[PDB]
């Protein structure tokens, strides 16, 4: 392929570098349209700038914790992180959430990959090894109230017991209820003055839930489970404009009152190089 | 049973892995993809559009105006603006070319930089743009500028003049993040002659500026971008 052909002097009626930009058409002008050049080469096709990349790396998307201790006397288990859960989504963590909000609707299969490590931050006489079990509670699914409910049978619920200090790589097909995922959804569940506006509505794939299958050793152990996700088999439609002002909550495009500028100021002059 | 030997790197969780992995939801069949206008394939298709550079930062806050490169009526030989080309910073740091190109570490190609006047139909002007490749500095006045790639432009019906910054570098790639070996250079714009104004009209007029990337643009090595942050996890 070629970089730019050779170009000699000129003089015409045909003025390439003079257009009317109020039409909306960003003119495909060129170097070799404005000067004397030479034939060169390309040897580049940006494999690294293809959307099945600049969207599809393994990045974290969310991090909670739990703990295995003696439940004997707990009113509510959750309140004890005896076991936990996740309203699956992506907005939790801004680094990836910025890449995705780069286009309007997106579509793909994913590589939800889990990993988890433990702490005995207090007079432990050995680091125990547990096994974490992570469930997937589809919206409409019964829910784990305790670290040893029946819910934790997972008869028809896709679960994976893996080990601490280790990881698990369970990949899932795209499960949009529609031809692709809505990123911004200027809508409401219904024509009712009093409902919530935002995509918060369009997006349940429900939750996730992790507990620790062992009966409390004697000392206390805390586990911090991390969830990593890699989009793959992507398509994206309608780019938009990238976020400038920071984030404030999942599924809202808000920004904080009283915020430091985003436009870097110009010390001195505009004339200033 | 078939004999194996495990190599160093077992169980390493490299995040950049294209590996084969099982379906948590087997036999499950998706929602039939339909059609949607506008569809991206490669970042590089969208950064070939233009956006406006706020070449006029000089504010207390962010401003619709930090975008308006003003023009001063009946002056001459004077400077209109300037800056350098660290498209991974300054003015540029907040455009679609920035914010994206920001996402990568290495770049190359030739920027196309546009410039549109909005002065009363019946006013004229003839100024000059000009790229000053790397070696000296901000031209600091016409003459010195003019001996660099530059382009006189006569204002008429065609509001926009499209100047193109020829990729002119030794090495064949440049650190997106600012660095001097891998420096880009500069560019200005001076009153060729001056800005005239029709009778019964008054003040200043303006130039809008945009910058888009070229056919030839190049970007590799994916880095993370600075431009965003969260001290903490967000909430429902």
């Amino acid at each position, epitope marked *: 392929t070629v970089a730019s052909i050779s170009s000699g002097p000129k003089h015409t009626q045909k003025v390439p570098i003079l257009t009317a930009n109020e039409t909306g058409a960003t003119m495909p002008v060129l170097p070799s349209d404005s000067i004397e050049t030479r034939t060169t080469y390309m040897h580049f096709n940006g494999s690294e700038t293809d959307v099945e990349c600049f969207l599809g790396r393994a990045a974290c998307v969310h991090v909670t914790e739990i703990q295995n201790k003696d439940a004997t*006397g*707990i*009113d*509510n288990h959750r*309140e004890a992180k005896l076991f936990n859960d996740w309203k699956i989504n992506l907005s939790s963590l801004v680094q990836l959430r910025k890449k995705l909000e780069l286009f309007t609707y997106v579509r793909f299969d994913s590589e939800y990959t889990i990993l988890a490590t433990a702490s005995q931050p207090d007079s432990a006489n050995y680091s125990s090894n547990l096994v974490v079990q992570a469930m997937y509670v589809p919206p409409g699914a019964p829910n784990p109230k305790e670290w040893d409910d029946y819910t934790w049978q997972s008869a028809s619920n896709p679960s994976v017991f893996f080990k601490v200090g280790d990881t698990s790589r369970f990949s899932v097909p795209y499960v949009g209820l529609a031809s692709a995922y809505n990123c911004f959804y200027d809508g409401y569940s219904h024509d009712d003055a009093e409902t*919530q506006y935002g995509i918060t509505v369009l997006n349940h794939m429900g939750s996730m839930a992790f507990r620790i299958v062992n009966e409390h050793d004697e000392h206390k152990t805390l586990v*911090k489970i991390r969830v990593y996700h890699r989009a793959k088999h992507v398509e994206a439609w309608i780019p938009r404009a990238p976020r400038a002002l920071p984030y404030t909550s999942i599924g809202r495009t808000n920004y904080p009152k009283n915020t430091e500028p985003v436009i870097k100021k110009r010390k001195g002059d505009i004339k200033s190089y | 049973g078939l004999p194996t030997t495990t190599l160093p790197g077992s169980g390493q969780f490299l995040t950049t892995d294209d590996r084969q992995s099982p379906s948590a939801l087997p036999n499950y069949e998706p929602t039939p993809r339909i059609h949607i206008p506008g569809k991206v394939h490669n970042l590089l298709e969208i950064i070939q559009v233009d956006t406006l550079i706020p070449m006029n930062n000089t504010h207390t806050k962010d401003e619709v105006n930090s975008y308006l490169i003003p023009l001063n009526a009946n002056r001459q030989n004077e400077q209109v603006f300037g800056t350098n080309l660290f498209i991974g910073d300054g003015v540029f740091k907040t455009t679609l070319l920035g914010e994206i190109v920001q996402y990568y570490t290495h770049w190359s190609g030739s920027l196309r930089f546009s410039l549109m006047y909005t002065g009363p139909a019946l006013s004229s002007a003839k100024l000059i743009l000009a790229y000053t490749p790397p070696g000296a500095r901000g031209p600091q006045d016409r003459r010195e500028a003019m001996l660099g790639t530059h382009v006189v432009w006569d204002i008429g019906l065609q509001s926009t003049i499209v100047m193109t910054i020829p990729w002119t570098s030794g090495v064949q790639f440049r650190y997106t993040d600012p660095d001097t070996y891998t420096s880009a250079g500069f560019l200005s714009c001076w009153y060729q002659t001056s800005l005239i104004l029709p009778p019964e009209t008054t003040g200043q007029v303006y130039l809008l500026s945009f910058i888009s990337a070229c056919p030839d643009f190049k970007l590799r090595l994916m880095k993370d971008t600075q431009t965003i942050s969260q001290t903490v996890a967000l*909430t429902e």
Partner: antibody
Framework: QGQLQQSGAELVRPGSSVKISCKAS????????VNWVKQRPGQGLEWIGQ????????KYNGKFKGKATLTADKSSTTAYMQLYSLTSEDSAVYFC????????????WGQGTSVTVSS | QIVLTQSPAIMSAFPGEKVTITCSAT?????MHWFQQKPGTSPKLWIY???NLASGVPARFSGSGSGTSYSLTISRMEAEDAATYYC?????????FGSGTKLEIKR
């Protein structure tokens, strides 16, 4: 034993949003939660949310989805939360309390902050 | 969402008169936490976990039950009884307090 010292009597013009506080004193903030209850005048011991400093783990009662936005600061060991779009329903009383020492519900309790919305 | 209900709404108790209150949640709450409030004070932990006399909560007191409906006792009311009572559910999640058997004094 600890303390849930609270913010001070609040007068907010309607439509605003204020932040009352709380601060733990002599127990490890970063371990137990802080619930908040909106016991209005001649009104019940209402439950806004509950937040956990420890990692930011939390939950809210569906009345206050929007209104209440619980929050903890790990150094000044000061819980908070602030109400948005104030209305004279928010004219009630907010209390914070330490939860889960476990034999007991929110055992340790704070005094409160008065929130009154009007011009 | 287990909807709580303090048994009487309020009465009055001549000191000596033994006092018994009750909570009747809809569903099953396993642990009844009883809070009390002599106004001008923060509500305070009387009986935790169905039947335990919290700290400093005197002996006349006590209570129990389960599943649904639990209760409270004060072998005979006093002065320091004419307060308000809150049973309190912690089992179901939008953690929800009682109603209010406003304890009443008789003279």
């Amino acid at each position: 034993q600890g303390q849930l010292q609270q913010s001070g009597a609040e007068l907010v013009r309607p439509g605003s949003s204020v932040k009352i506080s709380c601060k733990a004193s002599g127990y490890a903030f970063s371990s137990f939660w802080v619930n908040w209850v909106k016991q209005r005048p001649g009104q019940g011991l209402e439950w806004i949310g509950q937040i956990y400093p420890g990692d930011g783990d939390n939950k809210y009662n569906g009345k206050f989805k929007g209104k209440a936005t619980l929050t903890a600061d790990k150094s000044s060991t000061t819980a908070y939360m602030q109400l948005y779009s104030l209305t004279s329903e928010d004219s009630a009383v907010y209390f914070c309390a330490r939860s889960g020492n476990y034999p007991y519900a929110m055992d340790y309790w704070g005094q409160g902050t008065s929130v009154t919305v009007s011009s | 969402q287990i909807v709580l209900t303090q048994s009487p709404a309020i009465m009055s108790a001549f000191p000596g008169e033994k006092v018994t209150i009750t909570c009747s949640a809809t569903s099953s709450v396993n642990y009844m936490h009883w809070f009390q409030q002599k106004p001008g004070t923060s509500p305070k932990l009387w009986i935790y976990s169905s039947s335990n006399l919290a700290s400093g909560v005197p002996a006349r007191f006590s209570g129990s039950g389960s599943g649904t409906s639990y209760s409270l006792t004060i072998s005979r009311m006093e002065a320091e009884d004419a307060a308000t009572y809150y049973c309190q559910q912690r089992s179901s999640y939008p953690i929800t307090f009682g109603s209010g058997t406003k304890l009443e004094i008789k003279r």
